[model samples]
Target chain A: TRDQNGTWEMESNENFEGYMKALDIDFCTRKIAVRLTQTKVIDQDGDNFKDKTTSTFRNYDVDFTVGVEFDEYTKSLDNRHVKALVTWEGDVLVCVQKGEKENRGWKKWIEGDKLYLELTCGDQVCRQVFKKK
Target chain B: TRDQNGTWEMESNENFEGYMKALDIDFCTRKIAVRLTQTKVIDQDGDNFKDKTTSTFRNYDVDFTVGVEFDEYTKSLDNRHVKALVTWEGDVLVCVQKGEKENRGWKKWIEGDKLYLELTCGDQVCRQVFKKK
Candidate 1:
């Protein structure tokens, strides 16, 4: 897990609205997502992992195995079905979601005490930082 | 238009079958594509360009402007529609096609009298070389 397991509280979020816009998300959901506080709960068992993004407004849950591609439906997010693959590049955990969106992916890495997540859609990039809780 | 305009005949093609497999191309089409003799005809006008791939079996054509994203339909090839962006990175022409594939793109460059093309899909990479005609 390398310090990625356990709960992390969102310290800051930037350009989340723009990222949502790139995903063609509705304005109402974008506004709510930008205002909500998010918590990341990660549980890892060897190559199998469970990642939960919990908020008062909604929860996004994903269960995946490293290096395996799986079907992902963003129920409360963009509501798109994509073939998602997660792999490690150097020390970073990178996820590529293949579907209608191009250049759509996310990268997660740890720096100091911060868990950093960078989400990209088209040309927009949203950066989110979390602190261990 | 820096050494990119003109007709070039296919000199060498490598791993084209593997790249086609990564694109989920049908087995029958892959067999024909791998055996066909292909030629590249490039025409440039300032920032706008036409790139055509010619083969006896099938042909692919693209018209685009530099630094602009456009809808691309691979008519006789993979037959998938994608948002394609063409840009220059150093002296190489790089294309990123955003759609159902991850890390899918192609790069074109020149060396000596040979034009080089590298096509990537997932982990597969196909290298093609053409001699200026």
Candidate 2:
């Protein structure tokens, strides 16, 4: 396993507001969220993974056993419904979110001590680069 | 036992920088951490608890069974070694971290839908608020 078990900080974000808008996040909330920094905490124990997203405004935490599908509710940030499933695409962890929104999902991979998160919603791809802490 | 369960988003943080400095987290790590949004994910099953702190830069996850003393090593957030034990004081979940620092510990409690975490290191105290999602 290419270990990705630690906290990562958002160094840079690409198309963040656009992706939030694509997920139908409110105008005021999106504006506030854009300014706030987000942290991604990932804990991988064998085939099970803990994918947690946290910020000052809101937080989202999820636990999924790899290769299994689970009902996931994006409560605070997006307020959308999605069946999230994760699989290891080589060294990269690819997740497919199947739900009401089109072209929505995320992929996470690690490079050295830094972890990268690529989020998708509609045509907007939010590339979030995170530095290991 | 009052359930401190589910995902909690950090809403407000007080004196976090001072607490970080008390832990001796480097200038660069503290600088990156102060602005980052942190999420606390707690999975409580009976007396056992999974306390996970996550961000975009680094993550800290620890599991302990209530009332049981365990050796805890905080790697990513603050590199330290401590003997941690959790106990219930009324509805509040209290943890005592006996380590190198003069005063190092934390208290957690839930009021309505909001969760509160108070961290102590040396003489610095940091209060963190997280809203339930």
i-RMSD of all predictions: 28.9, 20.7
Error of 1 at B82 (Å): 56
| Every model's TM-score on chain B | 0.58, 0.58
- Model 1: clashing residue pairs? none
The DockQ of each candidate is 0.01, 0.03
Candidate 2 residue-wise lDDT, B1-133, digit = tens: 1344555555445454554444344455455555555555657554344445465432344556557788988754455688987777877768898886656787766566554556666555655555433
TM-score of chain B of 2: 0.58
- Candidate 1 docks at the CAPRI level of incorrect
Model 2 chain A worst lDDT window (10 residues): A17-26
lDDT of 2 by residue, A1-133 (tens): 2233455555445455554443344464445555666555556554244546555543456776567788987664445678988777776767898987766777766566444556666655645554433
TM-score of 1: 0.32
TM-score of each: 0.32, 0.36
Which numbered prediction scores highest in DockQ against the true structure? 2
